[PDB]
Design a protein around this ligand. Structure first.
Ligand SMILES: C[C@@H]1C[C@H](O)[C@@]2(C)C(C(=O)O)=CCC[C@@H]2[C@@]1(C)CCc1ccoc1
Ligand SMILES: [Zn+2]
Length: 856
């Protein structure tokens, strides 16, 4: 019997309006049963209903028309197309156009052993008892694994969820609990209130023994944090942050949060960082739970930013949703950007605005490659859709929005946002909808923003100065007929006011009022472009950084460091001139230019570590330590100062210890010895813990001691610090053990496996083990994490993108091409191949130049 539908996309003439979802999960057998009742209307006659279903055993399907006395039921025959993840329901007669019908489906499934669908999560009590819970993760296409549905984001509907569970367990879902009814078999049926109209991917439900803490907003919304009983005392910070941020967004968008409550649940097993399910946001425990004594400043910042991200989605994603995954950036670019807007207001002591440009540089890494994609690009299958959750949708999306906001001004941008959110509330949007909204306040918005969303990559802006005449040229930046509307900014030696010039053409000229000593484009790195200066331009700017680096802001200094090294890669600046510029860092004090320096310089020796280059690698590492030696030496071994001072300290001490800087190694050995002799009871400053643990794990006794403390820790920061330290061992049997254990999920959870694999991929002796492990265990890793997931992308890049020989390039090409449909077409594979090709060319051109430069 042939399947009566040949497309991946569903027919668009059968529309759902409301779902009634009844779910019973048996935690003892890992089996679940459901009854789905979906109210539908057909716009054209059909005897066939096509919908999504994946790994669900359908026992019965019926078609209802009317209610009570005037009720009719009809049996529905079921056909399956597993590859398209569809089912076809066959009625004995055609459906009458425009009349409401209810499709009733009874089914069963097994709780997923992955991190998606309706899945199993476990933890151990401090007494060592194993506890099992069931949670959901549906974005993008996994709602169809928990209940049959029209599983595309434009098929919005209301949802009335009912959960049957044991009296000893708690169930939570998107909406408040309205009633709990005693049913047969000693079960309780929880009835949750009907949701607002929303996408299937936002449905959520959890059956657990979680504890909770709550606080009410000024608008009367009940905000709650849920977590395992042993960790609920770490919920207070996120609870306070969530209340403040929810109030900020309501005030800012002038659109109230529409639900009576908002829950934030810390899940013991979670693949991504968090998920924005409407009324039930979910998080990795490390992304939500703060320990005032053991958590790092970076973890505290991470929690604040993640809560800000998920809450921004309540408007940008939930209330207004992209029509299709090709426009995922409308959700992700906005939520990423709003983290910075919201936290800059709510937590001005975190100084987050100063860190934003770092996201743009992250996007530029991928976007400089031929294998990048436009922000808005076609996608069809689930693996392609998952590939949209990447630095282009998130970081480039946020960066082009930041660039647009600076161009329009914050108030005109805000008016545009509010108009957009109001007009498209409970509906779906495409790119043109956003431009139309922004332009209704912005005459050039549509033409300009189409250049930034429909073309991959970014421009190189070349500056040539002839007296008062500033010549500008744009061209597509490509590693080794594109045209943008570029909102340029600049400052000069005569004016620190931010000047604006819209470059709509290949070339243009601006006439300065008077001649200047220097000009610097892309003020504060607020623009998604790079800049090259002709003639003595780079010598001049190098001179400025070396004489009066304070003449330009910390972010302007970071932008110069980054652009100089990006220009080496396209042969516009020599490696010697970029390295000469980096020498100014001997007097740098600020976190962003110091970190930008490390971001450009560390990858160079990471390439050398994987080659026969011991001498140059050692001299390069010695140069790096000598360059930052005064700054390293000034660091106190405490938790004193601002969040930026704490993060700078932690990374400087770790860098010094990793590269065997003796004053820091001897001090770290001392703290470790003292900490170990006290049986880990003595408190170490959190800021020095990474360095201290990395040093301590270099001995068998130290590694074993760290591992013994890991099993009992309730702190996410401490566990992450121990995992990092353990992965830095140069004992291959211990590195193999870490890969084996985290892969199995026994002693170390599988949610840690992608980071562990990358850390070992970066280990100077362990890198062959990580690449070999990925190849050997590929199928099981794909089954666990999914083809196209950001996790698989990070595992691919993390084990191969630091290779720089033709032999390594063929190993990568050969391996991934052998996978056929199970990974040969992954975008991350094309990206890593292109990265290795660039590494080969860069090393062949510059290795000897660096060798000579280091001797001089
Ligand atoms: C992400 C890095 C990975 C890198 O493999 C690593 C582990 C490193 C090494 O392997 O040599 C030495 C210093 C720390 C560094 C980092 C964690 C931190 C870099 C850093 C800090 C501040 O700005 C950049
Ligand atoms: Zn998001």
């Amino acid at each position: 019997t042939p399947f009566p539908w040949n497309k991946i996309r569903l027919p668009e003439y059968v529309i759902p309006v409301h779902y009634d979802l009844l779910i019973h999960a048996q935690l003892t057998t890992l089996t679940f049963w459901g009854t789905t009742k979906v109210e539908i209307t057909a716009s054209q006659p059909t005897s066939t209903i096509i919908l999504h279903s994946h790994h669900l055993q359908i026992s019965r399907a019926t078609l209802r028309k009317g209610a009570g006395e005037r009720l009719s039921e009809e049996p529905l025959q079921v056909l399956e197309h597993p590859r398209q993840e569809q089912i076809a329901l066959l009625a004995p007669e055609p459906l009458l156009v425009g009349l409401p019908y209810t499709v009733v489906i009874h089914y069963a499934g097994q709780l997923s052993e992955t991190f998606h669908g309706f899945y199993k999560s476990t933890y151990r009590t401090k007494e060592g008892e194993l506890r099992i819970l069931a949670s959901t993760q549906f974005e993008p296409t996994a709602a169809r694994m928990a209940f049959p549905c029209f599983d595309e984001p434009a098929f919005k509907a209301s949802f009335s969820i009912k959960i049957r569970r044991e009296p000893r367990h708690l169930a939570i879902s998107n909406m408040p609990l309205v009633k709990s009814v005693t049913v047969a078999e000693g079960l309780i049926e929880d009835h949750f209130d009907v949701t607002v109209k929303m996408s299937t991917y936002l449905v959520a439900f959890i059956i657990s023994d979680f504890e909770s803490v709550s606080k009410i907003t000024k608008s009367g919304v009940k905000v709650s944090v849920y977590a395992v009983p042993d960790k609920i005392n770490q919920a207070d910070y996120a609870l306070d942050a969530a209340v403040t941020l929810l109030e900020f967004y309501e005030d800012y968008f002038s659109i109230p949060y529409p639900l009576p409550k908002q829950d934030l649940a810390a899940i013991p097993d979670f693949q991504s960082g968090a998920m924005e399910n409407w009324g039930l946001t979910t998080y990795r425990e490390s992304a939500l739970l703060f320990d005032a004594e053991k958590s790092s400043a970076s973890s505290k910042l991470g929690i604040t930013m993640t809560v800000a991200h998920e809450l921004a989605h309540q408007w940008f994603g939930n209330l207004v949703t992209m029509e299709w995954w090709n426009d995922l950036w409308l959700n992700e670019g906005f939520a990423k950007f709003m983290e910075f807007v919201s936290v800059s207001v709510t937590h001005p002591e975190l100084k987050v605005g100063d860190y934003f440009f770092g996201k743009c540089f992250d996007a530029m890494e991928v976007d400089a490659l031929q294998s990048s994609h436009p922000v808005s690009t076609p996608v069809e299958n689930p693996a392609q859709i998952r590939e949209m959750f990447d630095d282009v949708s998130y970081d480039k999306g946020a960066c082009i929005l930041n660039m647009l906001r600076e161009y329009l001004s914050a108030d005109a941008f805000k008016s545009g946002i509010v108009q957009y959110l109001q007009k498209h509330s409970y509906k779906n949007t495409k790119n043109e909808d956003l431009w139309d909204s922004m332009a209704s306040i912005g005459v050039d918005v549509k033409t300009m923003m189409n250049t930034w969303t429909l073309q991959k990559g970014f421009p190189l802006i070349t500056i040539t100065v002839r007296g008062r005449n500033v010549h500008m040229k744009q061209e597509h930046y490509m590693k080794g007929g594109y045209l943008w509307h570029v909102p340029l900014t600049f400052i000069t030696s005569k004016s620190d006011m931010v000047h604006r010039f819209l470059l709509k053409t290949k070339t243009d000229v601006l006439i300065l009022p008077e001649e200047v000593e220097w000009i610097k484009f892309n003020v504060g790195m607020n623009g998604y472009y790079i800049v090259h200066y002709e003639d003595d331009g780079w010598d001049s700017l190098t001179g400025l950084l070396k004489g009066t680096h304070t003449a330009v802001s910390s972010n302007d200094r970071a932008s110069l460091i980054n652009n100089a090294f990006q220009l080496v890669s396209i042969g516009k600046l020599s490696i010697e001139k970029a390295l000469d510029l980096s020498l100014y860092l001997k007097h740098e004090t600020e976190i962003m230019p110091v970190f930008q320096g490390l971001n450009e310089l560390i990858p160079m020796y990471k390439l050398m570590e994987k080659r026969d280059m011991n001498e140059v690698e050692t001299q390069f590492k010695a140069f790096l330590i000598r360059l930052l030696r005064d700054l390293i030496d000034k660091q106190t071994w405490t938790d004193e100062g601002s969040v930026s001072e704490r993060m700078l300290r932690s990374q400087l001490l770790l860098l010094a210890c990793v590269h065997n800087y003796q004053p820091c190694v001897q001090r770290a050995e001392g703290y470790f010895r003292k900490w170990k002799e006290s049986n880990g009871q003595l408190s170490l400053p959190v800021d020095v813990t990474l360095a201290v643990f990395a040093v301590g794990a270099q001995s068998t006794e130290g590694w074993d001691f760290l591992y013994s403390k890991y099993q009992f820790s309730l702190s996410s920061t401490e566990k992450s610090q121990i995992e990092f330290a353990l992965c830095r061992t140069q004992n291959k049997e211990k590195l193999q053990w870490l890969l084996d254990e985290s892969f199995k999920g026994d002693k170390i959870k599988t949610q840690e496996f992608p980071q562990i694999l990358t850390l070992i991929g970066r280990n100077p002796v362990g890198y062959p083990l990580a690449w070999q492990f990925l190849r050997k265990n590929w199928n099981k890793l794909v089954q666990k994490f999914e083809l196209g997931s950001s996790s698989i992308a990070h595992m691919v890049m993390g084990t191969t993108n630091q290779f720089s020989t033709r032999t390594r390039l063929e190993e990568v090409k050969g391996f991934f091409s052998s996978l056929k449909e199970n990974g040969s077409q992954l975008r991350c594979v094309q990206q890593t191949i292109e990265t290795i090709e660039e590494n080969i060319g860069w090393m062949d051109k510059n290795f000897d130049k660096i060798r000579v430069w280091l001797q001089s």
